[PDB]
Amino acid sequence: GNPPIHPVYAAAFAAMKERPPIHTLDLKVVRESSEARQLAANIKLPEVIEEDKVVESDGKTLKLTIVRPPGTEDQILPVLIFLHGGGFVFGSKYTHIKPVRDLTVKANVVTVFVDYSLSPEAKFPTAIEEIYAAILWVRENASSLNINAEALAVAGDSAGATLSAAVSIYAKEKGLSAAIKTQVLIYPATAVSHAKYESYKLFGNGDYILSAEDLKFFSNAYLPAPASELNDKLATLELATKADLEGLPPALLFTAESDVLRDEGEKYAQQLAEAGVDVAAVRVLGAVHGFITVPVETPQYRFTINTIVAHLRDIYAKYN
Amino acid sequence: GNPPIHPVYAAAFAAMKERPPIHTLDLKVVRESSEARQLAANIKLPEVIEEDKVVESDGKTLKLTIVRPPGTEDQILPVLIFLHGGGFVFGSKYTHIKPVRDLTVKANVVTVFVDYSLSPEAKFPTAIEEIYAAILWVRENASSLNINAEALAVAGDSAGATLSAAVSIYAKEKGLSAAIKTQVLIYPATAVSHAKYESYKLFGNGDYILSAEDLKFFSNAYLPAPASELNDKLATLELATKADLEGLPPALLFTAESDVLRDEGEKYAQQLAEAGVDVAAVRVLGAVHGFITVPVETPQYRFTINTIVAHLRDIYAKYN
């Protein structure tokens, strides 16, 4: 309830302690709401070739961003489906620009960024259905995207990690069980009830970046009913049966040491292994929730990027 | 005291637990202790070029094994100093043949395996002094070994991890503080008293691979006096001051979830970060003490090898 955190994370929270709770803000705090604050960061970014597209698939209209390294336009690449965090309420290609551009050039892939519908304007399960539809589209247009559509991965942070895990189950229930070759899950949310876990108590009182109070706001925005009445594993992953999880694609899971969602994340890792799924799971020491989008580099930001890149290249090599 | 472990590790424990105990064996249990029982595993290994040498350095005589990938003999490579585990009492190039050959070929390096003096025939601090002398020898003969001696790292498991960390401090106190560019530490032992940490209680009662009874055997074998009377940081890393740890090289530390040494390993990570050292540290879920030398591959063995390879190549690149 009290180990040390890296000074960069401590400095970032202290600046945040001044602000009002979230339910008392105009949701066009999306604009400042670090599109602006992240541009002000001034951080180093690697050169990239970026392109936006608007398409139709499986009965939906989608917006996508396609990101590729320089000098690879004529080369056929593996593909990464990236799902951003933000509590289901915020986030865009501007807020997550640093980890997306880093993964793309270091792994040497084509990244498809899915700009899914945000809550509370949309609710469960619209985004899961959009992400399934985008996956179908990428398989249909591999030749025009210059990718090997069989070498495919899904990866995301926070709420994006929750979506990566659910669309892996959804795709299987639709008869598409061989499409996704790996799932990368960076501090996901999984629980019907969070107060069951010790980390909720230790880090949820408002002195760390993601509070028990913040969590209650995001759940109400995302869910169309209370989780206990909803009783749906695609909404709350913790409910998944051994049968639900059997045959899922190999997983890589990260958890943060000082994070209310820590223990429920580690419990889902255990659930996947019981069902026979290949799982590599680690707890990262000194880190807090959301650290992959923190602009000032730390030893754990660098470790996590490099470690994901090596896992992706290990998986992709089996399909070339 | 009760999370799940991988089925492979449970199987390995029952096979080891059925065998006669340690303090009731002739120390020429060395021939059978996974020189034969390893060979006998007959697992696939990758091709390598191996060479043994006997040399003089800093007033000592050393035995070394030098390992390199095929087709790189004329290319100048970075170098990895490797220190095997075994409680300070067992271990050789036959017991650790699998991770040494994997690291060598995947990272594309020259591995120098240091066959240090075993306990109880030798005691603290003889082995530490031998490893410093080998580091000096590697630096003297870089042109004859075909390596860039500046791009140098030290890595080890269990007791080999304890040795990696101590020789990083020893070398610094000798005025050789720029020689080691990174330390890789796989479940090390650090404590004066182990019973201060909760993981000693949870996993030390004889139902896991490294018991409190086993630990007591190795300490009495290695130490010339009790740790509390010795009061020496190079013997028990936990005693190290902030002043001792300043200016040390960047660390990668692995800890195992079901392992008596878990909490004291995680404490040493905190100590290094407090002193300003760059540290990436993780807890590996589902794993037990000693897992890097288990022959049957697990998702955790693969993750750990690939992740070390990605860290070594990150460090080496800034020196070429």
Numbering used by the authors:
A (entry chain A), B (entry chain B): 4 to 323
Paper text:
We recently characterized two novel HSL family esterases from the thermophilic fungus Rhizomucor miehei: RmEstA and RmEstB. The physiological substrates of RmEstA and RmEstB detected in our studies have been found to be short-chain triacylglycerol, linalyl acetate, and butyl butyrate. Both of these enzymes belong to the α/β hydrolases and exhibit distinct substrate specificities: RmEstA shows highest activity toward longer-chain esters, whereas RmEstB favors hydrolysis of shorter-chain esters. Both of the esterases were composed of a core catalytic domain and a cap domain, exhibiting the typical α/β-hydrolase fold. A classical catalytic triad consisting of Ser161 (Ser164 in RmEstB) as the nucleophile, His292 (His291 in RmEstB) as the proton acceptor/donor, and Asp262 (Asp261 in RmEstB) as the residue stabilizing the His was identified in RmEstA (RmEstB).
The crystal structures of RmEstA and RmEstB were determined at 2.41 Å and 2.27 Å resolutions, respectively. The triclinic space group of RmEstA was P1 with two monomers in the asymmetric unit. Amino acid residues 1–3 of RmEstA and the uncleaved C-terminal His-tag were not visible on the electron-density map. In the asymmetric unit, RmEstA formed a dimer in complex with three sulfates, and two of the sulfates interacted with two monomers via Arg104. Note that the third single sulfate was found in the crevice of two monomers, with four Arg residues from two monomers forming an arched area. The side chains of His292 and Asp262 in RmEstA were stabilized by a network of hydrogen bonds located at the carboxyl edge of β-strands 7 and 8, respectively. The substrate-binding pocket of RmEstA was a channel running through the whole protein and the entrance to this channel was surrounded by five α-helices (α1, α2, α6, α8, and α9), the 310-helix G2 (His197–Lys199) and the loop regions (His87–Gly90 and Ile291–Ala298). RmEstA can hydrolyze esters of longer carbon chain lengths (up to C16), with the highest activity observed for C6 (15), whereas RmEstB favors the hydrolysis of esters with shorter carbon chain lengths, with highest activity observed for C2 (16).
